[PDB]
Amino acid sequence: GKKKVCYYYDGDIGNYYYGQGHPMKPHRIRMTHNLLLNYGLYRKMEIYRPHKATAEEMTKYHSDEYIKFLRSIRPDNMSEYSKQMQRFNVGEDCPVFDGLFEFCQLSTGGSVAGAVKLNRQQTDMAVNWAGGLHHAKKSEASGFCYVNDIVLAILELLKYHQRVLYIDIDIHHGDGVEEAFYTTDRVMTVSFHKYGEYFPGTGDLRDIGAGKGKYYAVNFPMRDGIDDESYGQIFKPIISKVMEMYQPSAVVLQCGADSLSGDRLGCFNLTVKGHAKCVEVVKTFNLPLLMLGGGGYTIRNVARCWTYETAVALDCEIPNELPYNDYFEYFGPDFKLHISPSNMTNQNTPEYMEKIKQRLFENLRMLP
Amino acid sequence: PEELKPWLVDDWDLITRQKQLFYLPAKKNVDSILEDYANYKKSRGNTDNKEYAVNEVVAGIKEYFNVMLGTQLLYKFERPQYAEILADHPDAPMSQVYGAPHLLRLFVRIGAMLAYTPLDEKSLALLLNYLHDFLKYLAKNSATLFSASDYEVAPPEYHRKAV
Amino acid sequence: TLQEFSFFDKVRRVLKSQEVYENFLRCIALFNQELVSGSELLQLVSPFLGKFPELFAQFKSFLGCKRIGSSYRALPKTYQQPKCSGRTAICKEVLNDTWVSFPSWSEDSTFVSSKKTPYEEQLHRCEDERFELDVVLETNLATIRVLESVQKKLSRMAPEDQEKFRLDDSLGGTSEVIQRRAIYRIYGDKAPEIIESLKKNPVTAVPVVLKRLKAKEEEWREAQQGFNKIWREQYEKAYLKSLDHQAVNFKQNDTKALRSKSLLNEIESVYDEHQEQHSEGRSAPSSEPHLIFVYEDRQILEDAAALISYYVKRQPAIQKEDQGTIHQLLHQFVPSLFFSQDDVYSLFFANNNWYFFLRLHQTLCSRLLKIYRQAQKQLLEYRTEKEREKLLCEGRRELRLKQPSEVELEEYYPAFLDMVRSLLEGSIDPTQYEDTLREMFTIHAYVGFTMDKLVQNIARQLHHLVSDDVCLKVVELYLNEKKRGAAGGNLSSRCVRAARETSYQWKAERCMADENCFKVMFLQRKGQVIMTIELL
Amino acid sequence: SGGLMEQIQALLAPPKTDDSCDSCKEGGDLLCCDHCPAAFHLQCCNPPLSEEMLPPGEWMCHRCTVRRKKREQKPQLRRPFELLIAAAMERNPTQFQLPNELTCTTQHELDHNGLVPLPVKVCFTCNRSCRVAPLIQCDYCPLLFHMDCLEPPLTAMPLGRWMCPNHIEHVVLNQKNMTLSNRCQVFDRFQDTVSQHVVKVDFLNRIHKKHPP
Ligand SMILES: [Ca+2]
Ligand SMILES: [Ca+2]
Ligand SMILES: [Zn+2]
Ligand SMILES: [Zn+2]
Ligand SMILES: [Zn+2]
Ligand SMILES: [Zn+2]
């Protein structure tokens, strides 16, 4: 039934500028919130201001030298840090801009506050579309992500939860998150990702874990042009069995929206209804839940997807017609909530699906 | 004229194919290994008066490991290593720290590189003989000394630093 | 014993290759070297014999720094791990400290022309053009709001302390850089003296910057109105064309795949495939067809035949008696083959040309079938969309464009027929033809651009079919054989009429021997009819 | 090609106020000598050229330096070792190159117009041709395998030399701790040994016996 939920929005998260031509474009959250507000969803959901995460919270996972570099770096002093900038993968791929440390502060603070409230059992579901940056490593910035917020959220949740599930539905592989919990039995990293000459170039079938956490890390490589019903038929069984055998207490979802049709850097072909199918599937199991952001580069589609899955979290349905908003002219020329998929060829042929699914099932049967 | 070379294939694979670097201060620095060779070979002949040439050629191996290192001995993945060595302990013995496997590369090069210096017949003959028995002692105890198990790897930071 | 020799001969026969047999003997010799255990010996044998269950069972009865994964590899044992001050018991006991992976690629790589249409890069460019205005304007508006709030605050206490009021680095806001960024953008190089000014004496500096920002944001909003008007007329010219990723390729691939040589090679490949399998001696009966196709409507057959008649009736190159021949053929005999005039089958031994035309006919039927299903599906989704949207409380459960009415959506299909007919006349240029087709049938319309070429090719096949004596010979042989009752009939009576069918086969061989002969079979089930064709 | 970028950026402008290295034969950041077209990497110099070291102005190569300076100027092994040290000083920092004696040593596709080639060669697991899916031919044996026919199936094209799963060397590649050279010698031990039919068959019926002798 209907249950209480929390949303953390800091109105400034949209104001930061990654640089000209940078596909990481933080405006997306602001249009997401405006669309929610003009859908009349705020009457049933509580919106909160995230406290900026202290550097002491960040050093719980990251190296102190990395955090010192992040806090001390500015666009105006590029000369005085070039050695460290090369040393820390900050440059063309992950660039320095104004208030980057503030942006990372807010991103991690939202999800860590959600985790604190979740641990306290004050709600069973919280949303933070600013966070979910998963490509950040222990001491380096990669994949447009600087401070790996999800790992800090999970470390906070573990204080009261024995087992927790991390689900990645981004087109990329959650390399940092899995590498963090590569060798532990307290977390599973289920990642569905496109493989093959694609960033970050990790995430095979057999990257199945290590040490005590062996068999506790499942990956699903895919090919171009995965579609809606294929994703649906592959998601529900794998998830149902994973949370039958593991029986976790909390779940964390990274709703990477770069898996949608027509993305700037994606190859998948999912629709918004197909994307929200996953959130309905995971919620139906009735466990405390955390939803985070991440990728998504075709900005209008990102807004549409996040808005719809949020509305699904409230168990609320919304008219396919988009109500008026300050950024209405972005959704031309149809101005509709749901998007129609493209028609490129699906390389994920059914027997490939069956074989990968069977291997995953066999690998999961080994869990005690 | 080198023997039991396939160790060079392993060195090549671990350095520039497996992307697995070598320990900077691993053990048994090259000058130390040369001193060990000098000590061991001194107890071979009953009366090696020719120690005056034995030590001289061992020290010649030292001096040739002094300047030649870095120019045409390391691989493209090894530029950051040599840069860090030169920027961290320059006043320290540069013919030190670097372990044995880099030594064999010097002799592998010198066998063709000698072809531009016209030495006299007897001197080149003696040098050929000393290369030969140096390398046969190396082949004798290579398993004891050469070890590819302790070969660390390069995180992506070193990858950026290299190329 | 000779069982082993038979096993080796049959493994040589089923492997077709000497080198792989070398690999297999390598495996067994390695096992004989005692370096391989029986279970291991079988785990190396299985790749060889994983698809012949009988041989695998026979062989089984006969016998009676580290690195893991693909990207994870070790840190040095004597490596100075980066110290962390927030490490609790969980931080030590759960976190990885030995294994590392490497990002093999970089994002925003060479993907511009990898799989994207030329009409999508335009939309991406307009998206960026819109975003940069959105961000600069919204930063300016946020700064205006923040300084408005601070001014509303400042206008409320006694004047003797207003000169004592100061502003911090944040400019009174929550963010240290957002306001300063905005002022820098507004003022160019002269910004920081003004920043010092509003930090030092806010009371005399807030109104003047407020006024300048107000004028600037109104100017940018008007420019935004003009830019947004220009931005339209562009999403309309790209959205539907961006959703279609196959049309440009599909035109060429279908115009190349419909040549007669391609249609021949498609079945010769299957023939050689089954020949190689038969040489292998694998478990497969020697009666299974080569190509199976299906028609699931008769009205669609009438529609296709009507179309072909409509083209041929307006040709100059074929005379009136041949028009009558074509009409008789298409509208009487082809339905006769399909039994339009269960477990009932019809046989037909045909030459090269008959295979060509009748495969093209199957393709035309399949295209029209996909079109019909998509139209019906659109109608259903639109009806259920009204049904769902009419009863909707929106948030209570705690310009634009006019969509076509249901009448138009139902009228879509006959209109599409009129359109393709018109294209056959050629009075309608294919450009707005494909525009109209796409605008109706969305992403599924990619299949129907080249219908005119297919129809004209089928017409050439028909003209040649009437002109060539071998075809007419074939057809009247079929006629008298059906008169005898030999050709086609009940599935039960197959064993009864196999003899006369075999004689028909013999006649077909002696009639068309210097050319490739085809067998075609039409079996009817639950209203659908399944093509089966095979070579001889 | 009407781009909107220039106009929009000018409208938001702040006011302001008024091919390969000659040494390693590889690309990257290169400095080209102004007397000879040869170029060198920043780490292809004796000593290496760091970022802060480059002088303001023209750059000269080491070989051009030697030529310019020569034009301007116009049983003890101690002497051989001095000769060697002088030669090593003269040498250029190109690379260390392995001897060639150790480092050294189409039909299954649609036609140009697009067509199945004849005669056909088929996937080993299904005896089906290239029409259904692209065919991957092993670089060691002329076996063609599909994408989805292996176990486990591949997701993406193997860009390098693929290793077919019928070959035996997989049991040698299972080890994760042994050196490359041992693996290579084990591979080459089967790369020449052929035509041993009688011995292997004999061993097979030898092991076949239920009762050991
Ligand atoms: Ca993923
Ligand atoms: Ca784990
Ligand atoms: Zn170079
Ligand atoms: Zn020069
Ligand atoms: Zn196959
Ligand atoms: Zn092979």
Residue numbers in the entry:
A (entry chain B): 8 to 375
B (entry chain D): 200 to 362
C (entry chain A): 304 to 367, 394 to 670, 737 to 793, 802 to 939
D (entry chain C): 17 to 34, 57 to 112, 204 to 234, 257 to 364
What do the paper's sentences say?
Histone deacetylase complexes remove histone acetylation, thereby repressing transcription and regulating the transcriptional output of each gene. In order to address this, we reconstituted a recombinant version of the human SIN3B complex, composed of the subunits SIN3B isoform 2, HDAC2 (hereafter named HDAC for simplicity), PHF12 and MORF4L1, expressed in the baculovirus/insect cell system. Remarkably, SIN3B encircles the deacetylase and contacts its allosteric basic patch thereby stimulating catalysis. A SIN3B loop inserts into the catalytic tunnel, rearranges to accommodate the acetyl-lysine moiety, and stabilises the substrate for specific deacetylation, which is guided by a substrate receptor subunit.
In conclusion, SIN3B, HDAC, PHF12 and MORF4L1 interact with a 1:1:1:1 stoichiometry to form a V-shaped complex where the SIN3BCTD and substrate recognition module form two arms at the top, the SIN3BHID at the bottom, the HDAC is in the centre, and the SIN3BPAH3 connects the two arms in such a way that the HDAC is completely encircled by the SIN3B subunits. In the SIN3B complex, an additional histone recognition module sits on top of SIN3BMD and HDAC, and includes the MRG domain of MORF4L1, which interacts with the PHF12SID1, and the first PHD domain of PHF12 (PHD1). Strikingly, PHF12PHD1 recognises a composite interface formed by the MORF4L1 MRG domain interacting with the PHF12SID1 as also supported by our XL-MS data. The MRG:SID1:PHD1 ternary assembly form the histone recognition module (or substrate receptor) of SIN3B. Within this structure the PHF12PHD1 is located on top of the active site of the HDAC, suggesting that this domain could recruit the histone tail substrate to the enzyme. In conclusion, our data suggests that PHF12PHD1 and not PHF12PHD2 can deliver the histone H3 substrate to the HDAC active site.
